[PDB]
Amino acid sequence: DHAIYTAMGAASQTLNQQAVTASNLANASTPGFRAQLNALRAVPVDGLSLATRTLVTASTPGADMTPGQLDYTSRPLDVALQQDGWLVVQAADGAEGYTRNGNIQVGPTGQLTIQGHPVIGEGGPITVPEGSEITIAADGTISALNPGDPPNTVAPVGRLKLVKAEGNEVQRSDDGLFRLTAEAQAERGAVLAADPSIRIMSGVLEGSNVKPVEAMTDMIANARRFEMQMKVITSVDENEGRANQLLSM
Amino acid sequence: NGNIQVGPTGQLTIQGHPVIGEGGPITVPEGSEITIAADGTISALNPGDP
Amino acid sequence: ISSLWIAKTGLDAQQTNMDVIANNLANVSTNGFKRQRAVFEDLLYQTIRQPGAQSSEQTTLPSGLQIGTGVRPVATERLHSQGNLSQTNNSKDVAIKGQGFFQ
Amino acid sequence: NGAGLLYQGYVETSNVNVAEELVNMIQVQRAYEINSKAVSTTDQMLQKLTQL
Amino acid sequence: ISSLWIAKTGLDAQQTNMDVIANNLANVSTNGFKRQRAVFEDLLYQTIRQP
Amino acid sequence: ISSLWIAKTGLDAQQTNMDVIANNLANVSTNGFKRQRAVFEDLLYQTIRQPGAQSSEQTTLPSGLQIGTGVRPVATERLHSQGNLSQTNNSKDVAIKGQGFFQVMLPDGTSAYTRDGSFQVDQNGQLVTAGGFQVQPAITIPANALSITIGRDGVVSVTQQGQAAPVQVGQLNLTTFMNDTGLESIGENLYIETQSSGAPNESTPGLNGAGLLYQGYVETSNVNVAEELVNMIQVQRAYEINSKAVSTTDQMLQKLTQL
């Protein structure tokens, strides 16, 4: 009789998987977004007699670090990272996180922000002068030019901090930021060190990496699996609906 | 599959498989231009040479 | 159902982006107008099962479930670039070269 | 103080680039259609659930 | 989708090239003007590894 | 079901093909660009049962079941042919004949190799490429230079004010590789050495298989649009066919689950 539970579990898990797909289709245009993977894990429940029941659960083995294609917005302060590059920003709790949203904004006080989070480079959170035009070099060097000054007065005002994470040792937080996992921080220290090998380029912005074919195939598979599970459930219920009649006597 | 590639050491290969000619796996000179005849003969011209 | 409430947000984001594009295209011939670009940002995620570490050298995938929530439009920034100059030959038309606004 | 000059007899036209506007419109349409497909799929599976 | 944005970048590059061509043709009678040319460049290549 | 996975692999392969075609078409105006082409390869095959006995007084077909798996993109190769030359009349632009790569110095400290010949001069006189990357042989052109002339060989000379004889200031020797296809491409028309390409060897132009330098010309991209259009048509049709296959498999599965 309890076999139906197993079936319904799978059905429920399917919905969870579906939700993940919807999320990937929801933010299909957010810049610097990494698609959320999904997978199904079988849990063999053991016990006495003979082991037959095998439950199903859903899981997300992290995101995928395939770099998405980028738009050329010609904006002087929009950057795109390398194959495995990450910008370092300061989260709301004070810890640092790694992102790829190269859409930097300037406030009314020279504060450089990404999605409202401060940006930290060499030293600490950088701050350009009050109302200067900003240019970003290929290695993170920032050149600020105060308006009205002659063009030969360009002077560096800081340098970004780029880290290089493989992708198998970074886990997403609950707000979209990525952080080193336990093994990563154990083997590479609490905070990563900037490496000169990372190169960026200004004027372009990297979009999300969502494959429509993958989403469509996953949705079709989820629908078919859910319908099969419903068929199993109704068959089990109908079959069991006569053991009581047998017991009635 | 007629797509033939040349390795750094001049050893011919197709999809990672060393192609064998008359004898064993044929090895051409290092950086010579390779021309295929109408019967399988391979002509190698060392670049810069006459 | 969460799927409906996520796809609703997706459709709304696409609709707002289309409205922004339509507004940009509609007044293309107006003078001294700056285009707009709408940036989106994903909502927060809910972690259902914590990804408990194994470190058993089994090369197993991480077992952690984290569901998304959807997408919202966060900002619409306008690009203040220098546009082209068109001559009207009128004695009372002034075009700004650089940055600044009349009051 | 870093302020632009003035030209008389000229006006500044809008800096709208239609070449990318068309591309953005196409992408918006395709994403909208994809989300509609997702809605249809989840509605169909929910209807199958509530069939029994 | 990726090809769409690549083609958009190509369109923008061609638009910039036409812009400089038109600018050169406009002031063909300007004394002391110097001809202008635009040099383009490809974006980053993303690599895919195999086992 | 395996059919969906096979069709997904096919669709992804077609998408990658369209991606490389779009990449080739986009930078058709890039100087010194070598067009790419993607080559695929089929996956493994599962033998459900081996063929039995046959050709025994009978002409029966062999009863062997061997299911496929799909297709993956195995490589993307560029054709290091010779492009056409366009005149620019700029005395600091060099076109290269034959084989060879100018060696530039990346900011981090390593070196890259390029074909794009269009150089400029910084404030210190050194010859750099468009982007600021200094040319590794480090040619420095002095001030008050009336005109810079680069011969068919790598020698570069500049005539002074009073002196009749030009003064030599440097040599633009260039590098060659055993396998030019194996160079790893990055942005800004730069190639870096890998294990697939042999160790670079530097030589003067015109010797040891090196090319020749033409002053005031720029090498054009070797892209053929006629190939690209037909490839686009072919990949679009293949994509449509695979989508039809997905639709049919979905319909038959939906018919099954209505049981």
From Swiss-Prot, chain A:
Q: Report the SUPFAM superfamilies cross-referenced here.
A: Flagellar hook protein flgE
Where is this protein localized, as stated in its record?
Bacterial flagellum basal body
| Classification of source organism | Bacteria, Pseudomonadati, Pseudomonadota, Gammaproteobacteria, Enterobacterales
Q: Name one GO biological process term.
A: bacterial-type flagellum-dependent swarming motility
Q: Which domain of life is it from?
A: Bacteria
Question: Is Ribonucleoprotein among this UniProt entry's keywords?
Answer: no
Would you tell me the protein name for this molecule?
Answer: Flagellar basal-body rod protein FlgF
Keywords associated with the record: Bacterial flagellum
Q: How does it assemble?
A: The basal body constitutes a major portion of the flagellar organelle and consists of five rings (E,L,P,S, and M) mounted on a central rod. The rod consists of about 26 subunits of FlgG in the distal portion, and FlgB, FlgC and FlgF are thought to build up the proximal portion of the rod with about 6 subunits each.
UniProt source species: Salmonella typhimurium (strain LT2 / SGSC1412 / ATCC 700720)
Recorded GO CC terms: bacterial-type flagellum; bacterial-type flagellum basal body
Principal cellular location given in the protein's record:
other
Instruction: Identify the Pfam families for this entry.
Output: Flg_bb_rod, Flg_bbr_C, LlgE_F_G_D1
Q: Which family does it belong to?
A: Belongs to the flagella basal body rod proteins family.
Curated annotation (Swiss-Prot), chain F:
Entry's family note: Belongs to the flagella basal body rod proteins family.
As recorded in UniProt, coiled-coil segments are none
* Assembly and binders: The basal body constitutes a major portion of the flagellar organelle and consists of four rings (L,P,S, and M) mounted on a central rod. The rod consists of about 26 subunits of FlgG in the distal portion, and FlgB, FlgC and FlgF are thought to build up the proximal portion of the rod with about 6 subunits each.
Instruction: Tell me the protein's name.
Output: Flagellar basal-body rod protein FlgG
Q: Which GO terms describe its cellular component?
A: bacterial-type flagellum; bacterial-type flagellum basal body, distal rod
Q: Which GO terms fall under biological process for this protein?
A: bacterial-type flagellum-dependent swarming motility
Classification from the root reads: Bacteria, Pseudomonadati, Pseudomonadota, Gammaproteobacteria, Enterobacterales
- PANTHER family (alphabetical): FLAGELLAR BASAL-BODY ROD PROTEIN FLGG, FLAGELLAR PROTEIN
Protein location: Bacterial flagellum basal body
Give the UniProt keywords, A-Z: Bacterial flagellum
The encoding gene is: flgG
Q: Is this entry keyworded Cell inner membrane?
A: no
Kindly give the InterPro entries that the UniProt entry links to this protein.
Answer: Flag_bb_rod_N (IPR001444), Flagellar_basal_body_rod_CS (IPR019776), Flagellar_FlgE/F/G (IPR020013), Flg_bb/hook_C_dom (IPR010930), FlgE/F/G-like (IPR037925), FlgG_G_neg (IPR012834), LlgE_F_G-like_D1 (IPR053967)
Q: What is its main location?
A: other
